[PDB]
Amino acid sequence: MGSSHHHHHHSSGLVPRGSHMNEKVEKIVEELLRRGYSEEDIRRYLKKQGIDDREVDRAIKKVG
């Protein structure tokens, strides 16, 4: 009788709750920072994209 509880190796968890749209904001802001962009191009882009200087700075404070 094939009964196994094998290990999930190299796998992220799951979000069993409703996803608040900050999940997408924190994602899209971190996306360009994560690729080693300089803060010049980062802030220049996002402020133009309709992400306020306080909004992005708060999102960078959230990831910490």
Q: Is residue 40 part of a domain?
A: yes
Considering its fold, how many domains does the chain have in total?
1
Which residue, among 23, 22, 43, 24, has the nearest Cα to 32 in the 3D structure?
Answer: 43
Q: Is residue 56 part of a domain?
A: yes
Q: Is residue 13 part of a domain?
A: no
Range of the structural domain that residue 42 is part of: 22-63
Q: Is residue 9 part of a domain?
A: no
Cα–Cα distance, 9 to 55 (Å, whole number): 36
Method: NMR
In the numeric block, which tokens belong to residue 12?
Answer: 């992220």
Q: Is residue 8 part of a domain?
A: no
Long-range contacts of 29-35 (CB under 8 A, 24+ apart): 29/56, 29/59, 29/60, 30/59, 30/63, 33/60
Amino acid at 62: K
